[PDB]
Ligand binder design. Structure first.
Ligand SMILES: Nc1ncnc2c1ncn2[C@H]1C[C@H](O)[C@@H](COP(=O)(O)OP(=O)(O)OP(=O)(O)O)O1
Ligand SMILES: [Ca+2]
Ligand SMILES: [Ca+2]
Length: 341
DNA sequence: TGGAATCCTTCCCCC
DNA sequence: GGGGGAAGGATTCC
Protein backbone atom coordinates (compact mmCIF):
# COMPACT_ATOMS: atom_id res chain seq x y z
CA UNK A 1 0.00 0.00 0.00
CA UNK A 2 1.43 3.30 -1.32
CA UNK A 3 -0.66 6.41 -2.01
CA UNK A 4 0.31 9.41 -4.17
CA UNK A 5 -1.58 12.70 -3.74
CA UNK A 6 -1.47 15.67 -6.09
CA UNK A 7 -2.44 19.26 -5.30
CA UNK A 8 -2.36 22.04 -7.91
CA UNK A 9 -0.85 25.13 -6.28
CA UNK A 10 -2.84 28.33 -5.69
CA UNK A 11 -4.90 26.90 -8.46
CA UNK A 12 -7.36 29.51 -9.67
CA UNK A 13 -4.76 32.24 -9.43
CA UNK A 14 -2.03 30.17 -11.13
CA UNK A 15 -4.46 29.49 -13.94
CA UNK A 16 -5.01 33.25 -14.48
CA UNK A 17 -1.19 33.51 -14.52
CA UNK A 18 -0.77 30.72 -17.07
CA UNK A 19 -3.40 32.54 -19.16
CA UNK A 20 -1.56 35.91 -18.94
CA UNK A 21 2.08 35.40 -17.81
CA UNK A 22 2.55 39.14 -17.33
CA UNK A 23 0.86 38.44 -13.99
CA UNK A 24 3.78 36.37 -12.56
CA UNK A 25 5.70 38.14 -9.79
CA UNK A 26 2.69 40.32 -8.99
CA UNK A 27 0.23 39.57 -6.12
CA UNK A 28 -2.91 38.12 -7.70
CA UNK A 29 -6.29 37.82 -5.97
CA UNK A 30 -9.12 35.87 -7.67
CA UNK A 31 -12.38 37.30 -6.37
CA UNK A 32 -16.06 36.46 -6.25
CA UNK A 33 -18.02 39.70 -6.56
CA UNK A 34 -21.40 39.54 -4.82
CA UNK A 35 -22.43 42.75 -6.58
CA UNK A 36 -24.25 44.38 -3.65
CA UNK A 37 -21.87 47.31 -3.17
CA UNK A 38 -18.53 48.03 -4.85
CA UNK A 39 -16.15 45.18 -4.04
CA UNK A 40 -18.80 43.35 -2.07
CA UNK A 41 -17.57 39.83 -2.31
CA UNK A 42 -15.02 37.45 -0.85
CA UNK A 43 -11.65 36.08 -1.91
CA UNK A 44 -11.71 32.73 -3.69
CA UNK A 45 -7.90 32.45 -3.65
CA UNK A 46 -4.63 34.35 -4.06
CA UNK A 47 -1.08 33.47 -5.22
CA UNK A 48 1.68 33.24 -2.64
CA UNK A 49 2.73 36.76 -3.58
CA UNK A 50 -0.51 37.98 -2.02
CA UNK A 51 -0.90 35.17 0.46
CA UNK A 52 2.18 36.06 2.47
CA UNK A 53 0.54 39.32 3.61
CA UNK A 54 -2.63 37.75 4.99
CA UNK A 55 -4.81 37.91 1.89
CA UNK A 56 -6.49 34.49 1.61
CA UNK A 57 -9.58 32.52 0.71
CA UNK A 58 -12.65 33.79 2.51
CA UNK A 59 -11.68 37.24 3.71
CA UNK A 60 -13.91 39.93 2.22
CA UNK A 61 -12.60 41.68 -0.88
CA UNK A 62 -12.77 45.04 0.89
CA UNK A 63 -10.42 43.64 3.56
CA UNK A 64 -7.98 42.44 0.92
CA UNK A 65 -7.86 45.88 -0.73
CA UNK A 66 -6.90 47.51 2.64
CA UNK A 67 -3.89 45.24 2.80
CA UNK A 68 -2.83 45.11 -0.81
CA UNK A 69 -4.36 48.13 -2.58
CA UNK A 70 -2.28 47.52 -5.72
CA UNK A 71 -2.62 43.79 -6.21
CA UNK A 72 -4.38 42.46 -9.27
CA UNK A 73 -8.01 41.54 -8.65
CA UNK A 74 -9.72 39.19 -11.08
CA UNK A 75 -13.31 37.94 -11.14
CA UNK A 76 -13.68 34.18 -10.95
CA UNK A 77 -13.87 32.28 -14.25
CA UNK A 78 -14.74 28.77 -13.09
CA UNK A 79 -15.63 27.03 -16.32
CA UNK A 80 -12.15 27.98 -17.46
CA UNK A 81 -10.44 26.39 -14.42
CA UNK A 82 -12.83 23.52 -14.74
CA UNK A 83 -11.47 22.70 -18.16
CA UNK A 84 -7.79 23.15 -17.40
CA UNK A 85 -8.34 20.84 -14.45
CA UNK A 86 -9.87 18.11 -16.64
CA UNK A 87 -6.91 18.17 -18.97
CA UNK A 88 -4.58 17.56 -16.10
CA UNK A 89 -6.67 14.82 -14.60
CA UNK A 90 -6.45 13.06 -17.95
CA UNK A 91 -2.67 13.26 -17.71
CA UNK A 92 -2.60 11.42 -14.43
CA UNK A 93 -5.07 8.83 -15.73
CA UNK A 94 -2.10 7.49 -17.70
CA UNK A 95 -0.03 7.01 -14.60
CA UNK A 96 -2.64 4.75 -12.98
CA UNK A 97 -6.22 3.51 -13.35
CA UNK A 98 -6.88 3.63 -9.64
CA UNK A 99 -7.56 7.37 -9.34
CA UNK A 100 -9.83 9.39 -7.05
CA UNK A 101 -10.71 12.90 -8.14
CA UNK A 102 -11.21 14.61 -4.76
CA UNK A 103 -11.87 18.22 -5.74
CA UNK A 104 -11.26 20.62 -8.58
CA UNK A 105 -7.56 20.48 -7.70
CA UNK A 106 -6.75 17.27 -5.85
CA UNK A 107 -6.38 13.64 -6.79
CA UNK A 108 -4.95 10.53 -5.23
CA UNK A 109 -3.42 7.68 -7.24
CA UNK A 110 -2.97 4.09 -6.14
CA UNK A 111 0.47 3.22 -7.41
CA UNK A 112 1.17 -0.18 -5.88
CA UNK A 113 0.76 -1.98 -9.23
CA UNK A 114 3.28 0.52 -10.70
CA UNK A 115 6.02 1.07 -8.13
CA UNK A 116 8.20 -0.94 -5.73
CA UNK A 117 9.04 1.51 -2.92
CA UNK A 118 9.42 5.05 -1.57
CA UNK A 119 12.38 5.78 -3.90
CA UNK A 120 10.59 4.56 -7.03
CA UNK A 121 7.53 6.53 -5.82
CA UNK A 122 9.46 9.73 -5.39
CA UNK A 123 10.72 9.40 -8.99
CA UNK A 124 7.19 8.95 -10.22
CA UNK A 125 6.42 12.11 -8.26
CA UNK A 126 8.97 14.19 -10.15
CA UNK A 127 8.13 12.39 -13.38
CA UNK A 128 4.61 13.84 -12.88
CA UNK A 129 5.32 17.29 -11.45
CA UNK A 130 7.46 17.63 -14.53
CA UNK A 131 4.98 16.35 -17.05
CA UNK A 132 2.34 18.81 -15.74
CA UNK A 133 4.82 21.66 -15.61
CA UNK A 134 5.59 20.75 -19.21
CA UNK A 135 2.22 20.14 -20.89
CA UNK A 136 0.22 22.72 -18.95
CA UNK A 137 2.61 25.15 -17.22
CA UNK A 138 1.23 24.51 -13.77
CA UNK A 139 3.07 23.63 -10.57
CA UNK A 140 1.65 21.10 -8.14
CA UNK A 141 2.64 19.65 -4.80
CA UNK A 142 2.97 15.90 -4.42
CA UNK A 143 2.64 14.06 -1.05
CA UNK A 144 3.25 10.33 -0.54
CA UNK A 145 2.46 7.66 2.05
CA UNK A 146 0.64 4.45 2.95
CA UNK A 147 -2.84 5.95 2.77
CA UNK A 148 -4.78 8.99 1.65
CA UNK A 149 -4.82 10.94 4.87
CA UNK A 150 -1.06 10.81 5.19
CA UNK A 151 -0.48 11.51 1.53
CA UNK A 152 -2.56 14.67 2.00
CA UNK A 153 -0.71 15.69 5.13
CA UNK A 154 2.63 15.16 3.41
CA UNK A 155 1.50 17.58 0.75
CA UNK A 156 0.47 20.29 3.23
CA UNK A 157 3.98 20.25 4.63
CA UNK A 158 5.68 20.35 1.23
CA UNK A 159 3.60 23.14 -0.32
CA UNK A 160 4.08 25.02 -2.52
CA UNK A 161 5.85 23.32 -5.48
CA UNK A 162 6.94 20.52 -3.15
CA UNK A 163 7.19 16.76 -3.07
CA UNK A 164 7.40 14.68 0.09
CA UNK A 165 7.36 11.16 1.40
CA UNK A 166 6.00 10.25 4.78
CA UNK A 167 7.41 6.74 5.30
CA UNK A 168 6.11 4.16 7.81
CA UNK A 169 8.47 5.33 10.58
CA UNK A 170 7.58 9.03 10.19
CA UNK A 171 3.91 8.13 10.36
CA UNK A 172 4.78 6.75 13.82
CA UNK A 173 6.14 9.99 15.28
CA UNK A 174 3.42 12.04 13.57
CA UNK A 175 0.68 10.20 15.49
CA UNK A 176 2.37 11.39 18.66
CA UNK A 177 3.73 14.64 17.28
CA UNK A 178 0.98 16.03 14.95
CA UNK A 179 -1.50 18.52 16.33
CA UNK A 180 -4.89 16.92 15.80
CA UNK A 181 -6.23 20.17 14.39
CA UNK A 182 -4.04 19.47 11.38
CA UNK A 183 -5.80 16.22 10.59
CA UNK A 184 -8.01 16.32 7.45
CA UNK A 185 -11.60 16.44 8.60
CA UNK A 186 -11.10 18.17 11.93
CA UNK A 187 -12.19 21.75 11.52
CA UNK A 188 -12.53 24.44 14.17
CA UNK A 189 -15.51 22.90 15.90
CA UNK A 190 -14.05 19.46 16.41
CA UNK A 191 -10.64 20.89 17.37
CA UNK A 192 -12.34 22.68 20.23
CA UNK A 193 -14.39 19.68 21.42
CA UNK A 194 -11.19 17.60 21.27
CA UNK A 195 -9.25 20.06 23.37
CA UNK A 196 -11.75 20.01 26.22
CA UNK A 197 -11.64 16.23 26.01
CA UNK A 198 -7.91 16.23 26.56
CA UNK A 199 -6.91 15.30 23.00
CA UNK A 200 -4.30 17.62 21.45
CA UNK A 201 -2.39 14.99 19.55
CA UNK A 202 -3.54 12.09 17.45
CA UNK A 203 -2.39 9.58 20.05
CA UNK A 204 -4.57 10.90 22.90
CA UNK A 205 -7.47 9.29 21.08
CA UNK A 206 -6.64 5.96 22.68
CA UNK A 207 -6.56 7.27 26.28
CA UNK A 208 -10.35 7.92 26.15
CA UNK A 209 -13.23 5.47 26.51
CA UNK A 210 -14.72 5.12 23.03
CA UNK A 211 -18.35 5.73 24.09
CA UNK A 212 -17.40 9.15 25.55
CA UNK A 213 -15.66 10.04 22.33
CA UNK A 214 -18.70 8.91 20.33
CA UNK A 215 -20.74 11.11 22.64
CA UNK A 216 -18.72 14.18 21.88
CA UNK A 217 -17.91 14.05 18.13
CA UNK A 218 -19.95 11.25 16.58
CA UNK A 219 -19.14 7.61 15.95
CA UNK A 220 -18.09 7.94 12.35
CA UNK A 221 -15.53 10.60 13.27
CA UNK A 222 -14.45 8.69 16.37
CA UNK A 223 -13.81 5.47 14.44
CA UNK A 224 -11.86 7.50 11.89
CA UNK A 225 -9.49 9.15 14.35
CA UNK A 226 -9.11 5.88 16.21
CA UNK A 227 -8.12 3.78 13.17
CA UNK A 228 -5.79 6.56 12.09
CA UNK A 229 -4.12 6.37 15.45
CA UNK A 230 -3.59 2.58 15.32
CA UNK A 231 -1.71 2.73 12.01
CA UNK A 232 -4.82 1.08 10.70
CA UNK A 233 -6.68 3.55 8.48
CA UNK A 234 -6.86 2.24 4.98
CA UNK A 235 -9.81 3.48 2.95
CA UNK A 236 -9.30 2.76 -0.72
CA UNK A 237 -9.23 5.01 -3.80
CA UNK A 238 -12.76 5.35 -5.22
CA UNK A 239 -14.16 6.88 -8.37
CA UNK A 240 -16.56 9.24 -6.64
CA UNK A 241 -19.51 10.66 -8.63
CA UNK A 242 -21.53 13.92 -8.35
CA UNK A 243 -24.41 13.40 -5.96
CA UNK A 244 -25.82 16.90 -6.35
CA UNK A 245 -25.70 20.09 -8.38
CA UNK A 246 -26.95 23.51 -7.40
CA UNK A 247 -26.56 27.25 -7.48
CA UNK A 248 -26.89 29.94 -4.86
CA UNK A 249 -26.91 33.66 -5.62
CA UNK A 250 -26.79 36.84 -3.57
CA UNK A 251 -29.58 39.38 -3.79
CA UNK A 252 -28.79 43.09 -4.01
CA UNK A 253 -30.94 43.58 -0.90
CA UNK A 254 -32.01 41.44 2.04
CA UNK A 255 -35.71 40.73 1.60
CA UNK A 256 -38.76 38.85 2.88
CA UNK A 257 -40.88 39.66 -0.12
CA UNK A 258 -41.88 36.70 -2.30
CA UNK A 259 -41.88 38.66 -5.59
CA UNK A 260 -38.54 40.27 -4.82
CA UNK A 261 -36.82 36.93 -4.32
CA UNK A 262 -38.47 34.75 -7.02
CA UNK A 263 -36.37 35.89 -9.97
CA UNK A 264 -33.12 35.31 -8.11
CA UNK A 265 -34.52 31.88 -7.41
CA UNK A 266 -35.47 31.32 -11.04
CA UNK A 267 -32.04 32.29 -12.32
CA UNK A 268 -30.63 29.77 -9.85
CA UNK A 269 -32.85 27.03 -11.28
CA UNK A 270 -31.98 27.98 -14.86
CA UNK A 271 -28.26 27.71 -14.31
CA UNK A 272 -28.77 24.62 -12.23
CA UNK A 273 -30.69 22.99 -15.05
CA UNK A 274 -28.02 23.81 -17.63
CA UNK A 275 -25.35 22.37 -15.32
CA UNK A 276 -27.40 19.16 -15.05
CA UNK A 277 -27.15 18.47 -18.80
CA UNK A 278 -28.83 15.15 -19.48
CA UNK A 279 -29.08 14.43 -15.78
CA UNK A 280 -32.49 13.94 -14.17
CA UNK A 281 -32.95 14.68 -10.45
CA UNK A 282 -35.61 13.27 -8.11
CA UNK A 283 -34.95 15.78 -5.33
CA UNK A 284 -35.02 19.56 -5.11
CA UNK A 285 -33.85 21.63 -2.17
CA UNK A 286 -34.30 25.32 -1.61
CA UNK A 287 -31.45 26.87 0.45
CA UNK A 288 -31.71 30.30 2.05
CA UNK A 289 -28.96 32.27 3.75
CA UNK A 290 -30.77 34.44 6.31
CA UNK A 291 -29.56 37.97 7.26
CA UNK A 292 -27.22 36.71 10.07
CA UNK A 293 -25.55 34.08 7.85
CA UNK A 294 -27.53 31.15 9.27
CA UNK A 295 -28.57 28.57 6.71
CA UNK A 296 -32.07 27.09 6.53
CA UNK A 297 -33.14 24.57 3.87
CA UNK A 298 -36.49 23.06 2.88
CA UNK A 299 -36.88 20.18 0.43
CA UNK A 300 -38.80 17.41 -1.28
CA UNK A 301 -38.21 14.02 -2.94
CA UNK A 302 -40.39 12.81 -5.82
CA UNK A 303 -41.13 9.36 -7.23
CA UNK A 304 -40.28 10.66 -10.72
CA UNK A 305 -37.49 12.86 -12.09
CA UNK A 306 -38.08 16.60 -12.11
CA UNK A 307 -38.75 18.70 -15.20
CA UNK A 308 -38.12 22.41 -15.32
CA UNK A 309 -41.70 23.61 -15.01
CA UNK A 310 -42.08 21.28 -12.01
CA UNK A 311 -38.85 22.58 -10.53
CA UNK A 312 -40.11 26.13 -11.00
CA UNK A 313 -43.44 25.60 -9.31
CA UNK A 314 -42.20 23.33 -6.50
CA UNK A 315 -39.32 25.63 -5.65
CA UNK A 316 -41.70 28.52 -4.89
CA UNK A 317 -43.67 26.37 -2.44
CA UNK A 318 -40.51 25.47 -0.47
CA UNK A 319 -39.50 29.14 -0.38
CA UNK A 320 -42.90 29.94 1.00
CA UNK A 321 -42.32 27.28 3.67
CA UNK A 322 -39.13 29.10 4.66
CA UNK A 323 -40.64 32.60 4.97
CA UNK A 324 -43.55 31.11 6.94
CA UNK A 325 -41.29 29.09 9.25
CA UNK A 326 -38.40 31.56 9.65
CA UNK A 327 -38.90 35.23 10.56
CA UNK A 328 -35.53 36.54 9.27
CA UNK A 329 -34.65 38.40 6.07
CA UNK A 330 -32.89 36.62 3.25
CA UNK A 331 -29.45 37.43 1.93
CA UNK A 332 -28.79 34.55 -0.44
CA UNK A 333 -31.17 32.14 -2.22
CA UNK A 334 -30.68 29.02 -4.34
CA UNK A 335 -31.43 25.45 -5.32
CA UNK A 336 -29.74 22.10 -5.10
CA UNK A 337 -30.78 19.02 -7.13
CA UNK A 338 -29.97 15.56 -5.83
CA UNK A 339 -30.93 11.88 -6.31
CA UNK A 340 -30.32 11.47 -10.03
CA UNK A 341 -31.85 8.73 -12.11
C1' DT B 1 -18.83 33.67 -2.14
C1' DG B 2 -20.01 29.83 -3.99
C1' DG B 3 -20.08 24.53 -4.27
C1' DA B 4 -20.68 19.97 -2.74
C1' DA B 5 -19.86 15.68 0.49
C1' DT B 6 -21.18 13.35 4.61
C1' DC B 7 -22.49 12.89 8.94
C1' DC B 8 -26.06 13.24 12.84
C1' DT B 9 -30.37 13.74 14.93
C1' DT B 10 -35.16 13.46 14.66
C1' DC B 11 -39.44 11.87 12.92
C1' DC B 12 -42.17 8.68 10.81
C1' DC B 13 -44.37 4.00 9.08
C1' DC B 14 -44.45 -0.65 10.07
C1' DC B 15 -43.17 -5.61 10.62
C1' DG C 1 -36.49 -3.48 18.98
C1' DG C 2 -35.12 -2.50 14.51
C1' DG C 3 -34.90 -1.50 9.11
C1' DG C 4 -35.51 1.96 5.99
C1' DG C 5 -36.67 6.18 4.77
C1' DA C 6 -36.72 11.30 4.37
C1' DA C 7 -35.90 15.98 6.07
C1' DG C 8 -33.34 19.50 8.24
C1' DG C 9 -29.21 20.82 10.20
C1' DA C 10 -24.14 20.68 11.33
C1' DT C 11 -19.44 20.27 9.83
C1' DT C 12 -15.72 20.15 6.58
C1' DC C 13 -13.24 21.02 2.60
C1' DC C 14 -11.94 23.19 -1.61
N1 LIG D 1 -13.11 29.38 0.69
C1 LIG D 1 -13.16 29.28 -0.78
N2 LIG D 1 -14.03 30.02 -1.49
C2 LIG D 1 -14.05 29.92 -2.83
N3 LIG D 1 -13.23 29.10 -3.51
C3 LIG D 1 -12.35 28.34 -2.85
C4 LIG D 1 -12.29 28.41 -1.45
N4 LIG D 1 -11.32 27.55 -1.06
C5 LIG D 1 -10.80 26.99 -2.16
N5 LIG D 1 -11.42 27.45 -3.27
C6 LIG D 1 -11.11 27.08 -4.67
C7 LIG D 1 -10.04 27.97 -5.23
C8 LIG D 1 -8.77 27.27 -5.00
O1 LIG D 1 -7.78 27.67 -5.87
C9 LIG D 1 -9.15 25.86 -5.19
C10 LIG D 1 -8.32 24.96 -4.42
O2 LIG D 1 -8.26 25.14 -3.06
P1 LIG D 1 -6.97 24.71 -2.24
O3 LIG D 1 -6.39 23.47 -2.83
O4 LIG D 1 -7.30 24.39 -0.80
O5 LIG D 1 -5.96 25.95 -2.17
P2 LIG D 1 -5.22 26.69 -3.37
O6 LIG D 1 -5.18 25.84 -4.62
O7 LIG D 1 -5.89 28.04 -3.66
O8 LIG D 1 -3.78 26.97 -2.86
P3 LIG D 1 -2.82 26.03 -2.09
O9 LIG D 1 -1.64 25.60 -2.98
O10 LIG D 1 -2.26 26.75 -0.85
O11 LIG D 1 -3.56 24.80 -1.53
O12 LIG D 1 -10.56 25.80 -4.76
CA1 LIG E 1 -3.79 23.40 -3.98
CA1 LIG F 1 -8.34 22.49 10.89
Amino acid sequence: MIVLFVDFDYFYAQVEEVLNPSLKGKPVVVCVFSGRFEDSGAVATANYEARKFGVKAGIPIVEAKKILPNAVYLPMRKEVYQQVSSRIMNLLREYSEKIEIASIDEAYLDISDKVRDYREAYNLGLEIKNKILEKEKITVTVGISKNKVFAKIAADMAKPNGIKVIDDEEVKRLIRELDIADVPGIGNITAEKLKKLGINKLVDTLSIEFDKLKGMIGEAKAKYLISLARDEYNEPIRTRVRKSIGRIVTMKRNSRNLEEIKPYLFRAIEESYYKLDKRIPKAIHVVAVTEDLDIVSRGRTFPHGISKETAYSESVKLLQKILEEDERKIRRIGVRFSKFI
